[PDB]
């Protein structure tokens, strides 16, 4: 699912991509 | 030469691109979510395409490289990372499908709002609108005009979705020899191959459950006092020995009961321990906030922030020239550059969100030391409970007076202890029932033990055995009402706030007992101990790199997860629920309901 996550968040998947 | 000079030599090849390519994509993200403009969400749009290129690309060509054949263990730790991930074995077609799918859920959940019965053309959203209602509001039908408004308005435009959503995800999940998708998302917790410290993914379920079952008791306390309560501040709407109303519960689908306090505050004429008047007597701003959980970090012997966390954060709201997204989130950009971005606003609150922010910060920093795909916490319940043990330190009277928020004369007592306990529970117990309920329904449904004809049937029918909590108003197929909620509609895990919850109390009795405190544990800050953030620093420099049964290990001397020092916390409190719902009914029909 991941790899590398840049911001601690659960950001909106509209915007995040 | 061997096929292990060639990995290396590939490796060497993909992290050097690799930690190039993650910045300009995690710089791109900064740019947008600080200031939101078309050119922003192009460059990271753009910045975005090329990593995933990237990692898809390196991902197929790291197969030429079998784990079997590979004696380095980093090396190896590293290839599989590659080899896993990057991977979606679901055809371009479906794949295009399901990426609209979600953006149109997504969507859905921002974009929707509920204009009044009433009004002409006054739509509320979720966001402030309806949760401004869910959590302030003390009007029955208001609260249930906004709770099913939001539910059958926008819910109902979700279910065909999702359940598209169930068959391309578990043709994903299938894809990969994972029973189910729910099984892969169980995957997270999943250590096979080192020996002692293995754990498998039925396992996490038998472990979720066992511990659920000793949680049961204190939750059955917690709810029958709220329900004794909200009979006083409801009369008329609430049976004493049925469940509790779902649009009744502080909150929109009730996953924290925190805004119940002041109906269900056992002293009232009691002080409450907020110190925001003093924070702003004392001219505190975002800075001060900040500059404070820096020195927290450092009393127990971590890293002060970058000078580039100073420069490049965003810890407060840009104004109308500007637009930011003011989500609290700590930022690992990659190459030494760690930002947090906050609205902070001088209050209690965000001084504690501080702390968990810059926890990540210490986390992303600690780790940093790991090679580039080993640099993520070990399961994701790590990242949350460390912000969660900052923020239960720093919120107590021993720490705020020390800081100077709270006068040296405060009167902490037995009452000021059980009020505290209380209002922690609403929020932390609470929210252990309706998380594990909402997972097992998610796991079901994908697994296939719920069939589409009974989605919203069973999803009641749990919430009443498990949560205690019962719809206002019958609910039919029609309805999607576990997607009405971020996580679901967004397509994330939500086992992470339960397993993060245990290790987080886990966390705390050791770090507690390593700075050596006297009292209850609810009354501890380790502030001062070197050798707490020893302790804790030898788990967050591991990232990725150990089994997260080896990471808990280090920290708390166990190798799962365990609820004895959860309730240890609370045992304070389960001793006075259990005094005070003496007269009061223990217990719940799961058959009442407010439409009987
Ligand atoms: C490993 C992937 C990652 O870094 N994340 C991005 N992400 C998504 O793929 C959704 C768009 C969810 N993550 C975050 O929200 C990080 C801020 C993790
Ligand atoms: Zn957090």
Same mark, same amino acid.
């Given at each position: 699912?991941?790899?590398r996550?840049?911001?601690?968040?659960?950001?909106?998947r509209?915007?995040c991509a | 030469?061997?096929?292990?000079?060639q990995?290396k030599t590939?490796?060497?090849?993909?992290?050097?691109?690799?930690?190039?390519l993650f910045?300009?994509?995690?710089l791109?993200?900064?740019?947008?979510?600080? *200031?939101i403009?078309?050119e922003?969400?192009?460059? !990271?749009?753009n910045a975005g395409?090329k990593?995933? =290129?990237?990692?898809?690309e390196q991902?197929?060509?790291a197969q030429?490289?079998?784990?079997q054949?590979?004696q380095?263990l980093?090396?190896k730790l590293?290839?599989?990372?590659?080899?896993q991930?990057?991977?979606?074995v679901? #055809?371009?077609?479906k $794949?295009?499908?399901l990426?609209?799918?979600?953006n149109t859920?997504?969507?859905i959940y921002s974009?929707?709002?509920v204009?009044?019965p009433?009004?002409?053309?006054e739509c509320?959203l979720?966001e402030?609108?309806?949760?401004?209602?869910?959590?302030?509001?003390?009007?029955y039908?208001?609260?249930?005009?906004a709770?099913?408004?939001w539910?059958?308005?926008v819910? +109902?435009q979700?279910r065909?979705?999702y359940?598209?959503?169930?068959?391309?995800? *578990?043709?994903? =999940?299938?894809a *990969?020899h994972?029973?189910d998708?729910?099984d892969?998302?169980?995957g997270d917790?999943?250590v096979?191959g080192?020996?002692?410290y293995?754990?498998?993914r039925?396992q996490?379920?038998?472990?979720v459950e066992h511990?659920?079952?000793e949680i049961?008791?204190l939750?059955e306390?917690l709810h029958?006092?709220?329900?004794?309560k909200? !009979?006083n501040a409801?009369?008329?709407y609430?049976?004493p020995?049925?469940?509790?109303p779902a649009?009744?519960?502080?909150?929109?689908?009730?996953?924290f009961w925190?805004?119940?306090? $002041?109906?269900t505050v056992?002293f009232?004429?009691?002080?409450?321990?907020?110190?925001?008047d003093?924070?702003?007597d004392?001219?505190?701003?975002?800075?001060?906030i900040?500059k404070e959980?820096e020195?927290?970090?450092?009393s127990?012997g971590?890293?002060?922030?970058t000078?580039?966390? @100073?420069e490049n954060?965003?810890l407060?709201?840009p104004g %109308?020239?500007?637009k930011?997204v003011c989500?609290?989130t700590?930022?690992?950009?990659? +190459?030494?550059?760690?930002?947090?971005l !906050?609205?902070?606003?001088?209050? !209690?609150?965000?001084?504690?969100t501080?702390?968990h922010?810059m926890g990540?910060?210490?986390?992303?920093?600690?780790y940093?030391?790991?090679p580039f795909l080993?640099?993520?916490?070990? %399961?994701?319940?790590? &990242?949350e409970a460390?912000g969660?043990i900052? #923020?239960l330190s720093?919120?107590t009277?021993? &720490?705020?007076?020390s800081?100077?928020?709270?006068s040296?004369?405060?009167?902490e007592?037995?009452?000021?202890?059980?009020?505290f306990?209380?209002?922690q529970?609403?929020?932390?117990?609470?929210t252990?029932?309706?998380t594990?309920?909402?997972?097992?329904?998610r796991w079901?449904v994908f697994?296939?033990?719920?069939?589409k004809?009974?989605?919203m049937?069973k999803?009641?029918?749990?919430?009443?055995?498990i949560?205690?909590?019962?719809?206002?108003?019958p609910?039919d197929?029609?309805?999607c009402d576990?997607?009405?909620?971020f996580?679901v509609? %967004?397509?994330?895990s939500?086992?992470?706030?339960?397993t993060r919850?245990?290790?987080?109390?886990?966390?705390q009795?050791?770090?507690?007992?390593?700075a /050596?405190?006297?009292?209850?544990?609810?009354?501890?800050?380790? #502030?001062?101990?070197?050798?707490?953030?020893?302790?804790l620093?030898?788990?967050?420099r591991?990232?990725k790199?150990?089994?997260?049964?080896?990471?808990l290990?280090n920290?708390?001397?166990?190798?799962?997860?365990?609820?004895?020092?959860?309730l240890?916390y609370?045992e304070?409190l389960?001793? @006075?629920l /259990?005094?005070? %719902?003496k007269?009061?009914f223990?217990? @719940?029909?799961?058959?009442?309901?407010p439409?009987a």
């Amino acid at each position: 699912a991941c790899v590398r996550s840049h911001c601690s968040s659960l950001l909106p998947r509209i915007h995040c991509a | 030469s061997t096929i292990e000079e060639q990995a290396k030599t590939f490796l060497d090849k993909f992290n050097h691109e690799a930690e190039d390519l993650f910045y300009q994509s995690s710089l791109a993200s900064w740019n947008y979510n600080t *200031n939101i403009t078309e050119e922003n969400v192009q460059n !990271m749009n753009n910045a975005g395409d090329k990593w995933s =290129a990237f990692l898809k690309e390196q991902s197929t060509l790291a197969q030429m490289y079998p784990l079997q054949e590979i004696q380095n263990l980093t090396v190896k730790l590293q290839l599989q990372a590659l080899q896993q991930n990057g991977s979606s074995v679901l #055809s371009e077609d479906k $794949s295009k499908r399901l990426n609209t799918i979600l953006n149109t859920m997504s969507t859905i959940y921002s974009t929707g709002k509920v204009c009044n019965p009433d009004n002409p053309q006054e739509c509320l959203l979720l966001e402030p609108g309806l949760n401004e209602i869910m959590a302030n509001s003390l009007d029955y039908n208001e609260r249930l005009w906004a709770w099913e408004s939001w539910r059958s308005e926008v819910g +109902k435009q979700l279910r065909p979705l999702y359940e598209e959503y169930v068959v391309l995800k *578990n043709e994903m =999940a299938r894809a *990969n020899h994972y029973e189910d998708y729910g099984d892969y998302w169980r995957g997270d917790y999943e250590v096979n191959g080192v020996d002692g410290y293995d754990y498998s993914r039925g396992q996490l379920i038998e472990d979720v459950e066992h511990t659920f079952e000793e949680i049961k008791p204190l939750y059955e306390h917690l709810h029958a006092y709220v329900r004794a309560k909200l !009979m006083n501040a409801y009369p008329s709407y609430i049976s004493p020995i049925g469940c509790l109303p779902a649009h009744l519960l502080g909150d929109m689908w009730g996953r924290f009961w925190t805004n119940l306090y $002041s109906l269900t505050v056992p002293f009232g004429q009691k002080p409450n321990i907020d110190v925001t008047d003093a924070m702003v007597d004392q001219a505190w701003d975002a800075q001060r906030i900040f500059k404070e959980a820096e020195k927290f970090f450092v009393s127990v012997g971590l890293p002060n922030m970058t000078q580039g966390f @100073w420069e490049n954060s965003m810890l407060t709201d840009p104004g %109308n020239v500007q637009k930011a997204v003011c989500h609290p989130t700590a930022w690992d950009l990659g +190459k030494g550059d760690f930002r947090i971005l !906050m609205c902070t606003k001088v209050t !209690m609150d965000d001084f504690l969100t501080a702390h968990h922010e810059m926890g990540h910060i210490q986390y992303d920093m600690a780790y940093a030391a790991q090679p580039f795909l080993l640099r993520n916490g070990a %399961n994701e319940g790590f &990242h949350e409970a460390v912000g969660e043990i900052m #923020s239960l330190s720093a919120a107590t009277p021993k &720490h705020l007076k020390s800081i100077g928020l709270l006068s040296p004369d405060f009167q902490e007592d037995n009452e000021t202890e059980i009020n505290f306990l209380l209002k922690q529970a609403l929020t932390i117990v609470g929210t252990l029932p309706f998380t594990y309920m909402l997972e097992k329904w998610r796991w079901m449904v994908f697994k296939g033990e719920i069939p589409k004809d009974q989605w919203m049937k069973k999803w009641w029918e749990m919430k009443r055995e498990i949560v205690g909590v019962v719809e206002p108003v019958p609910h039919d197929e029609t309805y999607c009402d576990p997607a009405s909620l971020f996580h679901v509609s %967004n397509d994330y895990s939500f086992i992470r706030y339960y397993t993060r919850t245990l290790y987080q109390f886990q966390f705390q009795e050791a770090l507690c007992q390593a700075a /050596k405190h006297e009292g209850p544990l609810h009354k501890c800050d380790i #502030s001062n101990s070197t050798e707490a953030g020893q302790k804790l620093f030898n788990m967050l420099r591991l990232g990725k790199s150990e089994p997260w049964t080896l990471a808990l290990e280090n920290v708390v001397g166990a190798k799962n997860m365990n609820v004895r020092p959860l309730l240890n916390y609370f045992e304070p409190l389960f001793t @006075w629920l /259990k005094d005070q %719902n003496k007269n009061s009914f223990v217990g @719940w029909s799961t058959d009442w309901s407010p439409y009987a």
